[PDB]
Write a protein that holds these residues in place. Structure first.
Motif, PDB file in Angstrom:
ATOM      1  N   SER A  40     -14.100  -2.211  -3.981  1.00 22.87           N
ATOM      2  CA  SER A  40     -12.748  -2.570  -3.573  1.00 22.87           C
ATOM      3  C   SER A  40     -12.500  -4.097  -3.218  1.00 22.87           C
ATOM      4  O   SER A  40     -13.614  -4.658  -3.171  1.00 22.87           O
ATOM      5  CB  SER A  40     -12.168  -1.839  -2.749  1.00 22.87           C
ATOM      6  N   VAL A  45      -8.466  -4.070   1.434  1.00 24.53           N
ATOM      7  CA  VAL A  45      -9.318  -3.425   2.362  1.00 24.53           C
ATOM      8  C   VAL A  45      -8.925  -3.845   3.584  1.00 24.53           C
ATOM      9  O   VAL A  45      -8.809  -3.287   4.750  1.00 24.53           O
ATOM     10  CB  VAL A  45     -10.707  -3.330   2.082  1.00 24.53           C
ATOM     11  N   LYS A  46      -9.152  -5.229   3.847  1.00 22.92           N
ATOM     12  CA  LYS A  46      -9.128  -5.718   5.143  1.00 22.92           C
ATOM     13  C   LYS A  46      -7.532  -5.601   5.600  1.00 22.92           C
ATOM     14  O   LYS A  46      -7.508  -5.779   6.668  1.00 22.92           O
ATOM     15  CB  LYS A  46      -9.429  -7.369   5.168  1.00 22.92           C
ATOM     16  N   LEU A  48      -5.695  -3.267   5.718  1.00 21.08           N
ATOM     17  CA  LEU A  48      -5.756  -2.084   6.529  1.00 21.08           C
ATOM     18  C   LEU A  48      -5.811  -2.397   8.134  1.00 21.08           C
ATOM     19  O   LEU A  48      -5.329  -2.070   8.824  1.00 21.08           O
ATOM     20  CB  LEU A  48      -6.665  -1.151   6.175  1.00 21.08           C
ATOM     21  N   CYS A  49      -6.756  -3.381   8.398  1.00 18.02           N
ATOM     22  CA  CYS A  49      -7.114  -3.898   9.610  1.00 18.02           C
ATOM     23  C   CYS A  49      -6.097  -4.885  10.128  1.00 18.02           C
ATOM     24  O   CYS A  49      -5.753  -5.211  11.418  1.00 18.02           O
ATOM     25  CB  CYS A  49      -8.493  -4.379   9.735  1.00 18.02           C
ATOM     26  N   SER A  60     -10.595   4.552   6.632  1.00 19.00           N
ATOM     27  CA  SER A  60      -9.971   4.601   5.169  1.00 19.00           C
ATOM     28  C   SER A  60      -8.892   5.434   4.900  1.00 19.00           C
ATOM     29  O   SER A  60      -9.306   6.577   4.690  1.00 19.00           O
ATOM     30  CB  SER A  60     -10.718   3.940   4.041  1.00 19.00           C
ATOM     31  N   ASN A  61      -7.586   5.231   4.492  1.00 21.19           N
ATOM     32  CA  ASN A  61      -6.814   6.275   4.062  1.00 21.19           C
ATOM     33  C   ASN A  61      -6.806   6.636   2.455  1.00 21.19           C
ATOM     34  O   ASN A  61      -6.730   7.430   2.164  1.00 21.19           O
ATOM     35  CB  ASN A  61      -5.159   5.716   4.294  1.00 21.19           C
ATOM     36  N   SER A  62      -7.231   5.414   1.866  1.00 22.39           N
ATOM     37  CA  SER A  62      -7.546   5.522   0.216  1.00 22.39           C
ATOM     38  C   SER A  62      -9.100   5.750  -0.003  1.00 22.39           C
ATOM     39  O   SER A  62      -9.708   5.179   0.596  1.00 22.39           O
ATOM     40  CB  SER A  62      -7.059   4.410  -0.328  1.00 22.39           C
ATOM     41  N   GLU A  63      -9.371   6.868  -0.840  1.00 22.04           N
ATOM     42  CA  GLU A  63     -10.653   7.090  -1.220  1.00 22.04           C
ATOM     43  C   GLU A  63     -10.983   6.196  -2.257  1.00 22.04           C
ATOM     44  O   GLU A  63     -10.435   5.857  -3.449  1.00 22.04           O
ATOM     45  CB  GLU A  63     -10.842   8.632  -1.568  1.00 22.04           C
ATOM     46  N   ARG A  87     -13.841   8.228   2.244  1.00 20.21           N
ATOM     47  CA  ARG A  87     -13.198   7.320   2.922  1.00 20.21           C
ATOM     48  C   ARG A  87     -14.201   6.860   3.785  1.00 20.21           C
ATOM     49  O   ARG A  87     -15.485   7.228   3.882  1.00 20.21           O
ATOM     50  CB  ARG A  87     -12.225   7.859   3.889  1.00 20.21           C
ATOM     51  N   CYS A  89     -15.250   5.147   8.085  1.00 20.89           N
ATOM     52  CA  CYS A  89     -15.020   5.133   9.539  1.00 20.89           C
ATOM     53  C   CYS A  89     -15.561   3.785   9.897  1.00 20.89           C
ATOM     54  O   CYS A  89     -16.707   3.700   9.859  1.00 20.89           O
ATOM     55  CB  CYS A  89     -15.232   6.176  10.278  1.00 20.89           C
ATOM     56  N   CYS A  92     -12.890  -1.704  13.922  1.00 21.24           N
ATOM     57  CA  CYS A  92     -12.133  -3.105  13.613  1.00 21.24           C
ATOM     58  C   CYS A  92     -11.812  -3.990  14.915  1.00 21.24           C
ATOM     59  O   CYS A  92     -11.385  -3.202  15.817  1.00 21.24           O
ATOM     60  CB  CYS A  92     -10.977  -2.804  12.817  1.00 21.24           C
TER      61      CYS A  92
END
Length: 107
Positions: A40, A45-46, A48-49, A60-63, A87, A89, A92
């Motif tokens: 990805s 991805v970042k 999300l943080c 992560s909510n998306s696989e 996902r 863990c 962050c």
């Protein structure tokens, strides 16, 4: 200790198939025990943080597809590629997950 650039080469990848037998003997891997990459971009991805400021564990909510590399036993630094979907863990802080807490669940 680690930064976003380390997590970039550690868990972020721009290809499903990665070169582990060539990176493992480098100074970044120094012949590690195992690694887990994700297929990805660092923007989403970042993203999300985007909001985290202190150290916190998020999953992560998306696989996404994951290209991991496990060092086979009884072998002199030899990696094996393994693909999967799940996902992750991560810890962050400063809007950048620098450490890997675990996969799927977080103990």
């Amino acid at each position: 200790m680690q930064d976003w650039a380390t997590f970039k080469k550690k868990h972020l990848t721009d290809t499903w198939d990665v070169d582990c037998d060539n990176l493992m003997p480098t100074s970044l891997f120094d012949c590690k025990d195992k690694n887990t990459f994700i297929y990805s971009l660092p923007g989403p991805v970042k993203a999300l943080c985007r909001g985290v400021i202190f150290s916190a564990d998020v999953l992560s909510n998306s696989e996404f597809y994951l290209a991991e590399c496990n060092v086979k036993p009884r072998k002199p630094c030899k990696y094996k590629l393994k693909k999967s979907s799940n996902r992750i863990c991560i810890r962050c802080e400063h809007e950048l997950p620098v450490h890997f807490a675990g996969v799927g669940i977080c103990p």
